[PDB]
Design a protein around this ligand. Structure first.
Ligand SMILES: [Mg+2]
Ligand SMILES: [Mg+2]
Ligand SMILES: [Mg+2]
Ligand SMILES: [Mg+2]
Lengths: 418, 549
């Protein structure tokens, strides 16, 4: 003993002051939960009350994960994470394992509780200030700041890195084929092991973390994924025996759109079939020239797009379209017409008459997929009004991280993704 | 007889030095007044006399009427405030009377002067140095610095509030049978104790505050109820806000307007419908920051409009947490909506209005949705929960809307209330092409320079038309073409267009627009039985006759 866990000097990016984000309104149930959680954290010395001389603030709310029944404090450190210097040497020090996406099964574990065992740079503490608001503004908000690495702060996994590797070293030396990746407060463990064997391994790894603690409460949970069976959704053209004027016009529209992605696409012959003024529901026979062009186009679409690779220096963008009947399509790209992944979601918990809950879930699924594939979250373009989204998304959020997003307006691109 | 408090560490903004504003000339009268006042203040420990070594300075004023008393000392901290670090926001939200729960006994205490009894961070005092000029420049001015939070300093409100909260913490925690709320300078103390016992708790609370050198003005004897708390008249069963009289003048200063907007902002959550046109002047008025005279214009209309609304009293009941919150909405017209939130019928907690957001094209359903969200957020702020809604829209209309709308949308638990005018969908486009319905291939084009254009259509039944247009654009002519097809077709019609612009307006499902042409299209769609709108890429082998326009 006689030697503390000396802090790591951390600083904001040059010319940037700390975050000053307004706390959004909270339900009495969330306020009650936060009050009890913070009172306990304060007793454990993880957080401390602060005076008015601290002008900083970051929003906080609470989520009740699925099958946990216990409220979990969630701090929206999006603003502070942007203002926090990348720790390259230790922060960025967390390289992304390109092989996690090729694994049969991947399990996600909430390991953020471990970060509370490490003290935080005394001079940085003030920037982690947050406020638990009171109903009707009847009393001034209770203000705190962290004394240890906070969950949700990008700097937490970066500084804890060395400790994490030492805690898992025995486990990895025994399982050289298990890919373990740390992103924020989450730990992704991928293996091709047999399901039953996969689950036992996660539990063996689970013990190490618990065994470590000579310096809970959601560690027992586990989110299972299957990136091996993840497969993009290619562009397909209809296969018909009739073909109306309307069908052909939709086909030409779609091929025209695709010609922006695949240079070899041609619609000249098919277009010739639409020269005239016919009823939309009229059946038109395909000329042999049109039949041929359609076949050529159909082939071109079976091959991947040319010139598409991930550029780590650029942001990932995600677009989502509501297709109706609880189905949603999405594309992730950095440059237009150069998709890195396109997908489709059907069914989905929440289809129970709630569009916003479905979108919120689609956002979380897309984000986790993005974390696994590239090691970072995408910037979302959401098909919804700002006001609707900001009023309801926290009611259905179950992840411990939060991506960035902006709002969209009526694109015919939807039909092309059917 | 002894008294202790903790100070808050204060700092100037990074890279900035203290204030160094020179003291201007003062009349012999004002100087003698200031010397006296300061002598008194120094006797109470409010200020301390310093030497010539302190390089900082802030100017001091002297004013007032002998009525109440002699003169008053005023120190202008404008410069020090600009150099003082930022502090946590004291405001953030204003308590709504309907958010209070019923209490048998209530008392309001004024702690507006207690801030002058809170010590100032020792190392920051030197930045508050001021000087009283001597009789006639023949003696060095008397130098002073504050030892307590200064009246107009930037950190006084926030430091005082945090200090008060800390002092009250132990009293509230050890007296859970009473409720204490602090808004700016009013201390609300309520309980369900018999008056005798309640008064005893008040006495103990004042003696508690006294231990920290914080006094409360003497018994302001008056008949209660009503209990006055931050502008609300509290009664045991209901609350009231008396009519708010706005100032009547023909000359307005930046300060007058800031106080006016501050009063209106306060009244905004109480009274339905207010204003923000005078703000435009304030952003440019206080932009210059100068407390001069801004010529009021048009803000004149809203002012005369606010004045009328404020002529009436507002009454309401308290919140019963054992009952559900209910919000009912009504469409008034012109994009205006009214709502009432209550628990028991005819006993409103809060009533108000919602004006539609500014936009080119709108729809009644979109507006109702906005109003629901707005009311949801406000209810969560005041009561910490979402009310159940009673809406003037059929459950079936809502279903048709959200299932077909291209965006994700949602409304929380609600029930249909048959209260005209009901919100509905005025038209509904087809998902598939109509069989037997005439197909109109429309097109439009304009000449950028000449501003002249054409809009026409060709149909499968040989029908055709071209109409000339003047002072139009491509987008204008694209919409005229669609309008023409609607005008000359039957009750069912298929319309093929290459205009992404037009498709974008119609896919937004507007039932009203600012654009005359769009409104005309809307009126036409309303009359049709079935319409299928199809899109095709322009400049290709589609349509056939696009050479005619
Ligand atoms: Mg906060
Ligand atoms: Mg009264
Ligand atoms: Mg109101
Ligand atoms: Mg056109």
């Amino acid at each position: 003993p006689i030697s503390p866990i000396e802090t790591v000097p951390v600083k904001l990016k040059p010319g940037m002051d700390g975050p000053k984000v307004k706390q959004w309104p909270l339900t009495e149930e969330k306020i009650k939960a936060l009050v009890e959680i913070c009172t306990e954290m304060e007793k454990e010395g993880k957080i401390s009350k602060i005076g008015p001389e601290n002008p900083y603030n970051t929003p906080v709310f609470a989520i009740k994960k699925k099958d946990s029944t216990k409220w979990r404090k969630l701090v929206d450190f999006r603003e502070l994470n942007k203002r926090t210097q990348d720790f390259w040497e230790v922060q960025l020090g967390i390289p992304h394992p390109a092989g996690l996406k090729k694994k049969k099964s991947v399990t996600v574990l909430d390991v953020g509780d471990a970060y509370f065992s490490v003290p935080l740079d005394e001079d940085f503490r003030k920037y982690t200030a947050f406020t638990i608001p009171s109903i009707n503004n009847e009393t001034p908000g209770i203000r705190y700041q962290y004394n240890v690495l906070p969950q949700g702060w990008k700097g937490s996994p970066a500084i804890f890195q060395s400790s994490m590797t030492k805690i898992l070293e025995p486990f990895k030396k025994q399982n050289p084929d298990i890919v373990i990746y740390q992103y924020m407060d989450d730990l992704y463990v991928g293996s091709d092991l047999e399901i039953g064997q996969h689950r036992t391994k996660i539990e063996e790894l689970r013990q190490h973390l618990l065994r470590w603690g000579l310096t809970p409460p959601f560690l027992w949970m586990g989110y299972e994924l299957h990136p091996d069976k993840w497969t993009v959704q290619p562009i397909v053209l209809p296969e018909k025996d009739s073909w109306t004027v309307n069908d052909i016009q939709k086909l030409v529209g779609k091929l025209n759109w695709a010609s922006q992605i695949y240079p070899g696409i041609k619609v000249r012959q098919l277009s010739k079939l639409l020269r005239g003024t016919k009823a939309l529901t009229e059946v038109i026979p395909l000329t042999e020239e049109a039949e041929l062009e359609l076949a050529e186009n159909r082939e071109i679409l079976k091959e991947p797009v040319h010139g598409v690779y991930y550029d780590p220096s650029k942001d990932l963008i995600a677009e989502i379209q509501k297709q109706g009947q609880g189905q949603w399509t999405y594309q992730i790209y950095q440059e237009p017409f150069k998709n890195l992944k396109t997908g489709k979601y059907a069914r989905m918990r929440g289809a129970h008459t709630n569009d916003v809950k479905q979108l919120t879930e689609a956002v979380q699924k897309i984000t986790t997929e993005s974390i696994v594939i590239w090691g970072k979250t995408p910037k979302f373009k959401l098909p919804i009004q700002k006001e609707t989204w900001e009023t309801w998304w926290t009611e259905y959020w179950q992840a411990t991280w939060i991506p960035e997003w902006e709002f969209v307006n009526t694109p015919p691109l939807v039909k092309l993704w059917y | 007889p002894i008294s202790p408090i903790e100070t808050v560490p204060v700092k100037l903004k990074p890279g900035m030095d203290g204030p160094k504003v020179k003291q201007w000339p003062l009349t012999e009268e004002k100087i003698k007044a200031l010397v006296e006042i300061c002598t008194e203040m120094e006797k109470e420990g409010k200020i301390s006399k310093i030497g010539p070594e302190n390089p900082y300075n802030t100017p001091v004023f002297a004013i007032k009427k002998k009525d109440s008393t002699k003169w008053r000392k005023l120190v202008d901290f404008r410069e020090l405030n600009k150099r003082t670090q930022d502090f946590w926001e004291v405001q953030l939200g204003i308590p709504h009377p309907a958010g209070l729960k019923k209490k048998k006994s209530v008392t309001v205490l004024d702690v507006g002067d207690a801030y002058f009894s809170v010590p100032l961070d020792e190392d920051f005092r030197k930045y508050t140095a001021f000087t009283i000029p001597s009789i006639n420049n023949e003696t060095p001015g008397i130098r002073y610095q504050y030892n307590v939070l200064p009246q107009g300093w930037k950190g006084s409100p926030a430091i005082f509030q945090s200090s008060m909260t800390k002092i009250l913490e132990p009293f509230a925690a050890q007296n859970p049978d009473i409720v204490i709320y602090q808004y700016m300078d009013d201390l609300y103390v309520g309980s369900d104790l018999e008056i005798g016992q309640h008064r005893t708790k008040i006495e103990e609370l004042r003696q508690h505050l006294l231990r920290w050198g914080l006094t409360t003005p003497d018994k302001k004897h008056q008949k209660e109820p009503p209990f006055l708390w931050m502008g609300y008249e509290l009664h045991p069963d209901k609350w009231t806000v008396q009519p708010i009289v706005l100032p009547e003048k023909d000359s307005w200063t930046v300060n007058d307007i800031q106080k006016l907007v501050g009063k209106l902002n306060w009244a905004s959550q109480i009274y339905p419908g207010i204003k923000v046109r005078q703000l435009s002047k304030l952003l440019r008025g206080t932009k210059a920051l100068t407390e001069v005279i801004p010529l009021t214009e048009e803000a004149e209309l809203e002012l005369a409009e606010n004045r009328e609304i404020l002529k009436e009293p507002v009454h309401g009941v308290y919140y019963d947490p054992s009952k559900d919150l209910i919000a009912e909405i009504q469409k008034q017209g012109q994009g205006q909506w009214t709502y009432q939130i209550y628990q028991e019928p005819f006993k409103n907690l809060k009533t108000g209005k919602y004006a539609r957001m500014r936009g080119a094209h709108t729809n009644d359903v979109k507006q109702l949705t906005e109003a629901v969200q707005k009311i949801t957020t406000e209810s969560i702020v005041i009561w910490g929960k979402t009310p159940k809604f009673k809406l003037p829209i059929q459950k079936e209309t809502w279903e048709t809307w959200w299932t077909e709308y291209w965006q994700a949308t949602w409304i929380p638990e609600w029930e249909f209330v048959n209260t005209p005018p009901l919100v509905k969908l005025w038209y509904q486009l087809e998902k598939e092409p109509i069989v037997g319905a005439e197909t109109f291939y429309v097109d439009g084009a304009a000449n950028r320079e000449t501003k002249l254009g054409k809009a026409g259509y060709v149909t499968n039944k040989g029908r055709q038309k071209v109409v000339p247009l003047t002072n139009t654009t491509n987008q204008k002519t694209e919409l005229q073409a669609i309008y023409l097809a609607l005008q000359d077709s039957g009750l069912e019609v298929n319309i093929v267009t290459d205009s992404q612009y037009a498709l974008g307006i119609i896919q937004a499902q507007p039932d009203k627009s600012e654009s005359e042409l769009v409104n005309q299209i809307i009126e036409q769609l309303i009359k049709k039985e079935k319409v299928y709108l199809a899109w095709v890429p322009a400049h290709k082998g589609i349509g056939g006759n696009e050479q005619v326009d």
